Amino acid sequence: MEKEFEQIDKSGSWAAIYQDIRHEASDFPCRVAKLPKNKNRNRYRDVSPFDHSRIKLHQEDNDYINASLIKMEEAQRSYILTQGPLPNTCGHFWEMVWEQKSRGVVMLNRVMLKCAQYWPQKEEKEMIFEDTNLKLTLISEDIKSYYTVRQLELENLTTQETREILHFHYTTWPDFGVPESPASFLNFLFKVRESGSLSPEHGPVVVHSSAGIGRSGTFCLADTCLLLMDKRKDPSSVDIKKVLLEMRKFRMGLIQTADQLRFSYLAVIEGAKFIM
Template sequence: MATPVSPEDWEVSDFELASSTSGTSVTLSSTSLVSVESRCTDEEEEEEGMLKWGYLSERMTMESEFQVWEATRGWHQAFLEVSDRCYDYTSQVGRSLENRSRNRYANVSPYDHSRMQGEDEQNNYINASFVMVEEAQRKYILTRGPLPNKCSHFWLMVWQQNSRAVIMLNHLVENNNTKCSQYWPLCQGQTLLFKEMGISVCMLKEEVRISFTVHFLRLKSTMMREVRSVFHFHYTGRADFGVPKALASFLSFLFMVRESGCLNDEQGPAVIHCSAGIGRSGIFALVNTCLVLMEKREDPFCLNIRQVLVNLRKYRMGLIQTPKQLRFFYMAVIKGVKFLMADENFKKKWKALSNVRPGPSYDESLSQTHTEFEDTVERDAGFSDLATRTPNSGGREQ
């Protein structure tokens, strides 16, 4: 299957970092899900197939793969092999004449079997996909950056899915091209009202760091008179991921989001977006998923992370858009798991590169839903200093 590439969407630059080698309601179509399951091979067939397309041995670790592809400059071939293993599912709804103007890029549409369907009877289409990883007990909504006429649908989806976090991985404008609309309030105290959806969004607080910003938002349903707290995590680091500081800043951002608890299974699915919702968004979801899976294994480096990528592409097309992104994906997973394994030498080096000091633990009281508007106003001061956090020693996502 040819992997769609949206114009100018996050091309990762070359790296010279040798050290990297050492209850939510979702409406899905039942018939489509059966079709997906019928096309999945069993575990032995998958393993046999993986051995045929580039694995030197059954026990080859991801670090060994990285070293081989670095030495042979084989990232392009590895990328093509991943694409060859992926199915092209139907996306008739997203490509229909009625919905073409609601897609940011003509060649990036959600699959019919995994697309999000809102409760707006007039038009329930939004270019967003529900991604479920049962083994990792993680779920995500991957979507494109909101268009001007779809910001209200975006926030309605956040409300309906009871999402605790919106994770933004792009700038509003990149290379003089608009990548996303301004869908959240501009400053502390400002409120955006989306009358047609009965949703208001107020910014309670903003914390700005070198490579990311955290907005503490209050969502209110004007019809239900219910209020919820939502985090808006915005990664503002350089899109080309310059070496070596950018990789560390990305991991700082990822671990900060993980420690917030917003990615945990008991929460609604986190909404993750970049411009097209497949490049940077795919990297974030994949790295987090792989780290969770590796924490569950006796030998974490034996995780077949290319198969994880193939599995997630069953839910949204084109995750990981370029060979350079595939390379960055490997580097982030390898470095990330080394941090979680509490290698003290690595942690010291990583903290020096990231230059982010640790902060306090997440305040679980933020996860409570309130029925009275005034309750959240009184709790504004209860937000923890989330944007200053890096992983604590030996800390892991719960």
Template sequence: MALTNIEKEYEDFVKKNSWLLIYYKICREGQPQHLTTIEAKKPHNKHLNRYRDVSPYDHTRVKLNRIERDYINANYVNIPRANRKYILTQGPLAATMGHFWLMVWEQCCTGIIMLNRLIENKETKCHQYWPGEVGSESIYEDVQLAVTLISEQNKNYYILRKFKLQDLESMNTREILQFHYITWPDFKVPKSPTQFLEFLSDVRSSGILDSSGPPIVHCSAGIGRSGTFCLVDSTLFSMESEGVNNVDPKEILKNMRTQRMGLIQNTDQFRFSYLAIIEGVKRFDPNYKEAPIEDIYSEVDVSSTETLNIDPSCAPPLPPRGASLETRPCFGPLPPVPVDSTQDDLCSSSDSSECNSPPQSPSRFGHLKDEKEETEALFTKTSQEGPTLRVKAGTPNLRRPLQRLPTPEPEKKPKKPKWLPISIIMALGIFAIGYLYVYY
């Protein structure tokens, strides 16, 4: 069977080891200088952003109508050729849960696609914005909405929840589905495209991607995992109508990045998108036999055979910070490396036991009442156990555990003999006595 264009392109990227070059080129061309984020930088909106360096573009941002201030960290991402329109947003903060549900109501959304856990690598990535138990209700008085958890089904690698969203002003209700993917590590990719494509198939079958209201897609920052999901879905959908060889994922990604900044954060996510698209196309071919797929966790060698002429000013946005704006930054010396630290402790591995453990109900996290309280509790526990070194997800792989280098001692200057000044004084005294004796 002849290779498709995307398969040939994938093999060419692997052969030339040019993933980084292509990724930076997309980042440069998909980030026009004229795009602004003025609204996100206003003082009264800064605390509504989970990360300082992830802001919605002004020309595509979602605006709230019911409340006085219309700001929420969310963007429309429209892909006309795929007949797809998404809303990509950050994981809600404690102060923005009501705003999140108001956006769901006003945009007539019927589905939410959540691609992260509430807590990852001991950091809060998203506040629990839904009731913790089936039958319980949460009321958001600031937006006059009530949310009731109707059902919750554990699907092994994702959780399907059904909510009743009620407008307390009109008393109208809507049913909202939430697909919560719980095995996708932060800054990384799923171990295999197969499981992800099964998840995508279930999401499509529910109809939330085809409804009149755009689905809401979010992870923690709403750019990495969310961007990967939208790129794979929209590319596969375009290929179904236009043909496999008539769609270029790179062009779709460039278009997406002009609507929300930083979509797809690294080369691993970019390469996984290609693998998932290739696998997704073949799943519809009855003659296809599954073949071994390259390990997506193998490193991307930055020393390509091609010269990387990359302008630092055009580089993609840095990975979002690990702490929310609600947490005051700590300015102090780095804590010492624990004596019993291992490489696994120091390397931020996405293959943690948390990511690979059997999925459990989110109720094990408890119904989080306040994100700030949870953060303070985490730091309190840390201070009691002693200082530890934390490496954020997305940090490049460390070959060896970090070591504290010995501080070089300052160079010692040779000491002058203590007797030298005394000798000089004595010589001057003898000279003076001799002078007086001769002339007087």
């Protein structure tokens, strides 16, 4: 399957292959995302959850967040892909994490102005979201060369229940851009895996980036292809293009560039050297 990459790379036809996928992509209504009232709940006019797959906040007021549940049946893995929270939607965001029983949050964009800072910078400075009634405290953070992992405590003030959330932040990935190498990213991925944040025991991990489509789509596409190869009887059968289009049924626009598409291949290619 490496060869297929070799065929596109040598052809230098990557832009075309990305366009094929785009044409072949799903389309579904986005009636709620487009509601006049939800206008400021979306970071981008051009990026919206399909109505069928959108996550619903369970609190009475309004049930809308710009998030999509991606369900991959064969791989038995689920992802929530969402836009980087707006200053108004932080409360909503944390509510979705509580309600969906998520143990992990994967962030693939730098704060630089792509996304609000929705988590506590200091332990001493915990956050309260009065709209959704959630208190968030930063327990601990470990900073590394390529990424940061933080341990947070999200407490539902209503129920006085507590949950430990692990925050995984890839800090070296530029917007609309690709990391210099797949291994740094793959290492990031296994760290996320190792933590169990992707276990079926827990709710679907929340993955986000600025738009919640390109960087995030790469992370999810990569993990799934690699999962499939492990699970499957013949690993050679796994087709990235097939996998990407299945995900795009759940959320529009996953993987935004030809450059991202090439990277997913490289990452998946390098990733399965490891698994194998």
